[PDB]
Design a protein around this ligand. Structure first.
Ligand SMILES: [Mg+2]
Lengths: 51, 55, 44, 107, 51, 100, 250, 97
């Protein structure tokens, strides 16, 4: 089962604003966009930058 | 071969027919065909009404 | 005469539009089915 | 029939009978063709209702991929992790709105 | 009974005349249909493209 | 090579000037289109300045100068649907594409 | 310079003249040169799409005569006798091993005979519908009528690029006054027009009237079509076949 | 079973080719050409049935009276057979009587 990041009709900014609106509770879009990021994916993307 | 806003001709035909038989005119236009038809034969008087209209 | 301009309010009248006039031909019922025919023109 | 089919009792996403109306429609993807007959009236929703739809409840993922394709499509997914596909072939614009809102009020 | 046999004789005749008149007025209005031409034009327009 | 049309600001004044180039009297908008070569020259100047003439199917309904100014005062906004619907500034809850 | 091609037959006063711009293919970027008119009976009758569908049917069924056939209970090979023992076995008796109930025999009620469906239907009505479709093409931003179908160039690419430059349509049908008098350059360039076509005088017809996106009529030919529709207008009771001589036939 | 197995041969058909391009061009031949020749001759089809379209029995009757002396003996016996069949078919047994 592939991640939904690898199917059609996905936009990270759009999904972030969806993460804001869907719970009916506002948030700082830049802050939440940072917040959904852990560090394991950061390490994975940094290692992927080397290839 | 009617042309124009045929519903006006229908209202006029009902109005002329109003004294003629009393009942409201049972009439239908043929908008694509551009015609008007009235139930019943009121023929010669209708020709007279068109003639008195002149056009 | 609003007719021609009202027609101009659509796309080009292509071959995909020439409809038979409603009331052209009564439906060609194959003499069968659950409603029209069970014995098809002869009865029992 | 019924006994030839499975069962699933009446429940919610996350016992949301208490907290708040956690609207369970994450994604939904209608699509029309640039030259598409069947989606013509559906294009009408793409004309009218979709902006009205996001006006009425913006918190969902509205998608018009709108390929040069063969028929209209509705891809509904949600926080329950399932998906329902809804054909809109040869439907009405009023029926398009009815299908949209009925999909919205589901789970 | 609350009245004599001839007492209400005709006591409901005007409404009977009205009802028979109403039946006569609404009954026999069957004739050829009235057909607009814009409907035929719209059925021609049904193969509409997008922009 | 562009069908895009925008009504100009000096349209009434340039229209009166072109009408004077076509013919004099008052009530400029009431000049009928029964004349032939005058109509040809008038529509020629109007199209040459405007860049947008009426449709040839709309020529037969052109019978006066008032409607001539009006159809020349009518804005013609034209774009592709992937260009038009997208530019209507829809809300953030949808971003539709038409990759055709 | 100017040009004013009015209609020869006197159009009645109950409508004004039916006017439009007059074009030509000479200018590769120079159109709208001259303007003319036509009678309401030429391009401005009632809409009447139903007449057009009548024209469509009388076209698409005009000459086709299908040839598919079959065999009957005596046509396909074999079969004179009782096929097998009728009652000795538990099977079913028949009349033949060549009736239509078995594996190889007859297609019992299939299309027998090479059939045809010719329809010389109401020709004046066909004329009026042909006029109707011409009128539809007139109002639909399609009747771009040119002065003369001369080719200023010999390359078909010139026609294609002008057509995209004119925003005429995706398909073009240009028709002239006389086939022998059709210009050699125009047909020569047109020979590679894979989707456009050129046509002679009598060829303006219904499936043709839908065939391209738009039609390009020659001006004297447009008058010829007008005269034809005018002779179509008010045709008296025919008491002789109209191919022979008359009082004023031509 | 009763279906195909793969997607069938790709239906290469150009709907806008030349042999269909003129399909009915110059076919309003009669009133648009000053009455020289009717459409009732413009059809390229068999002379048994070029425009007198009756019933099936009528179709065969015309086939006989037009071209019977031009057939091989199998066709003559066949046309005679079905002609006898149809002549019995019209007036013997049916739904309306
Ligand atoms: Mg067989």
């Amino acid at each position: 089962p592939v991640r939904r990041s690898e199917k059609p009709n996905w936009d990270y900014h759009a999904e972030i604003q969806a993460f804001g609106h869907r719970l009916q509770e506002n948030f700082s879009l830049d802050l939440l966009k940072t917040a959904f990021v852990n560090s394991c994916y950061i390490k994975s993307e940094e290692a992927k930058r080397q290839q | 071969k009617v042309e124009g806003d045929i519903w006006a001709l229908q209202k006029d035909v009902e109005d002329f027919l109003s004294p003629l038989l009393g009942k409201t005119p049972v009439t239908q236009v043929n908008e694509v065909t551009g015609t008007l038809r009235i139930k019943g034969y009121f023929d010669q008087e209708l020709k007279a009404w068109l003639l008195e209209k002149g056009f | 005469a609003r007719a021609l301009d009202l027609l101009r309010g659509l796309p080009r009248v292509s071959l995909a539009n020439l409809k038979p006039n409603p009331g052209s031909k009564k439906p060609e019922r194959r003499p069968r089915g659950r409603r029209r025919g069970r014995k098809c023109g002869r009865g029992h | 029939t019924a006994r030839g089919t499975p069962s699933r009792f009446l429940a919610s996403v996350l016992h949301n009978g208490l907290g708040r109306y956690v609207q369970q429609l994450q994604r939904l993807s209608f699509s029309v063709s640039r030259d598409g007959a069947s989606s013509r009236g559906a294009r009408e929703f793409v004309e009218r209702e979709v902006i009205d739809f996001a006006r009425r409840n913006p918190g969902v993922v509205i998608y018009v991929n709108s390929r040069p394709c063969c028929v209209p499509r509705v891809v509904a997914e949600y926080l329950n992790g399932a998906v329902r596909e809804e054909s809109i072939h040869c439907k009405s614009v009023e029926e398009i709105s009815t299908l949209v809102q009925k999909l919205a009020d589901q789970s | 009974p609350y009245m004599t046999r001839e007492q209400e004789r005709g006591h409901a005749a005007v409404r009977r005349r009205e009802a028979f008149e109403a039946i006569k007025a609404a009954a026999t209005s069957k004739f050829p249909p009235h057909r607009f031409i814009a409907d035929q034009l719209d059925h021609l327009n049904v193969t509409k493209k997008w922009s | 090579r562009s069908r895009a049309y925008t009504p100009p600001e000096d349209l009434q004044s340039r229209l009166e000037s072109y009408v004077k180039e076509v013919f004099l009297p008052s009530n400029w908008q009431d000049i009928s289109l029964e004349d032939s070569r005058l109509k040809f020259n008038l529509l020629a100047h109007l199209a040459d300045d405007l860049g947008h003439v009426v449709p040839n199917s709309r020529l037969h309904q052109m019978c006066r100068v008032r409607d001539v100014l009006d159809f020349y005062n009518v804005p013609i906004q034209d774009r592709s649907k992937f260009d038009e619907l997208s530019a209507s500034n829809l809300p953030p809850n949808l971003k539709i594409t038409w990759s055709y | 310079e100017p040009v004013l091609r009015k209609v020869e037959l006197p159009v009645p006063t109950h409508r004004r003249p039916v006017q439009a711009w007059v074009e030509s293919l000479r200018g590769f970027e120079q159109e709208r040169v001259g303007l003319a008119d036509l009678h309401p009976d030429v391009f401005a009758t009632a809409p009447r799409l139903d007449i057009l569908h009548q024209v469509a049917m009388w076209q698409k069924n005009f000459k086709r005569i299908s040839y598919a056939k079959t065999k009957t209970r005596a046509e396909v090979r074999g079969g004179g006798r009782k096929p097998w023992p009728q009652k000795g076995t538990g099977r079913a008796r028949h009349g033949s091993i060549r009736s239509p109930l078995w594996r190889g025999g007859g297609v019992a009620h299939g299309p027998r005979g090479p059939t045809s469906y010719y329809y010389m239907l109401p020709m004046k009505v066909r004329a009026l519908g042909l006029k109707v479709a011409l009128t539809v093409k007139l109002a639909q931003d399609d009747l771009h009528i040119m002065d003369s179908l001369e080719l200023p160039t010999g390359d078909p690419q010139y026609l294609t690029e002008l057509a995209h430059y004119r925003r005429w349509g995706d398909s073009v049908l240009l028709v002239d006054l006389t086939h022998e008098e059709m210009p050699q350059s125009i047909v020569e360039a047109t020979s590679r027009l894979k989707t456009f076509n050129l046509i002679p005088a009598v060829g303006l017809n219904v499936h043709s009237m839908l065939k391209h996106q738009t039609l390009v009529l020659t001006l004297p030919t447009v008058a010829f079509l007008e005269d034809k529709l005018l002779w179509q207008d008010s045709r008296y009771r025919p008491l002789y076949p109209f191919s022979l001589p008359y009082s004023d036939f031509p | 079973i009763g279906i195909r197995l793969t997607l069938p041969p790709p239906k290469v058909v150009d709907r806008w080719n030349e042999k269909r391009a003129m399909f009915g061009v110059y076919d309003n031949i009669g009133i648009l050409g000053n009455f020289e020749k009717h459409p009732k001759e413009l059809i390229r089809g068999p002379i048994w049935l070029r425009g007198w379209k009756g019933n099936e029995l009528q179709r065969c009757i015309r086939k006989r009276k037009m071209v019977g002396s031009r057939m091989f003996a199998d066709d003559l016996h066949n046309l005679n057979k079905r002609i006898r069949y149809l002549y019995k078919h019209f007036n013997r047994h049916g739904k309306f009587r």
